[PDB]
RNA sequence: AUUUUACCAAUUAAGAAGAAUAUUAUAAUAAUGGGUGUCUUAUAUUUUAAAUAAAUAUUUAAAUUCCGUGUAGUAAAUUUAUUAU
C-alpha cells in the first residue's frame, strides 16, 4: 500500500495519486484541524443583533 | 667581366536593421484533455474510493521522550486571492 509505504504520490510531484483518497476535499486537513474556527471557544456564533 | 649576405617584426576603428510584436520575474477576471494539410462510422472513444496535497499552515512555553523534529478562532462567506496578449 502506498500510504503504508509512505510514498509521496502527488500529481504535481510525479503525476500520480493514491487511489484510496477522495477526489474532492471540501476543507483541507489544516481547515479541519483548526478547531477554534469550528467550535465555540471564543468566537461569536450568531452575528444578527436584533 | 660580375654582382644587393644570413637572421630577426608587430592586430588592429566594424561594410549593411546579420538582433526584438525578444530573455526572465511580474496580471489573483479564462479554462472538458489545444493540434492547422481539418473533413461520416461508436458492440469499437467509461476512472470512479472519507487518508499530505497541482487545495501548501503568523512565536521561543509545557509535554510525551536515551539529541523535546513542536504554538492555538482573529474575525464567523472578510478583502492572501493560482493570476495571463
Automatic annotation (TrEMBL):
Positions that bind NAD(+): 40, 46, 49
The organism's place on the tree of life at top rank: Eukaryota
Protein name per the record: Uncharacterized protein
Lineage, uppermost ranks: Eukaryota, Discoba, Euglenozoa, Kinetoplastea, Metakinetoplastina
Section covered of the full-length record: 27 to 76 of 242
Amino acid at each position: 500500500t502506498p500510504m503504508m509505504l509512505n510514498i509521496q504520490n502527488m500529481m504535481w510531484w510525479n503525476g500520480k495519486r493514491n487511489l484510496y483518497r477522495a477526489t474532492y476535499r471540501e476543507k483541507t486537513w489544516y481547515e479541519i484541524s483548526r478547531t477554534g474556527a469550528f467550535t465555540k471557544g471564543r468566537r461569536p456564533v450568531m452575528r444578527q443583533k436584533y
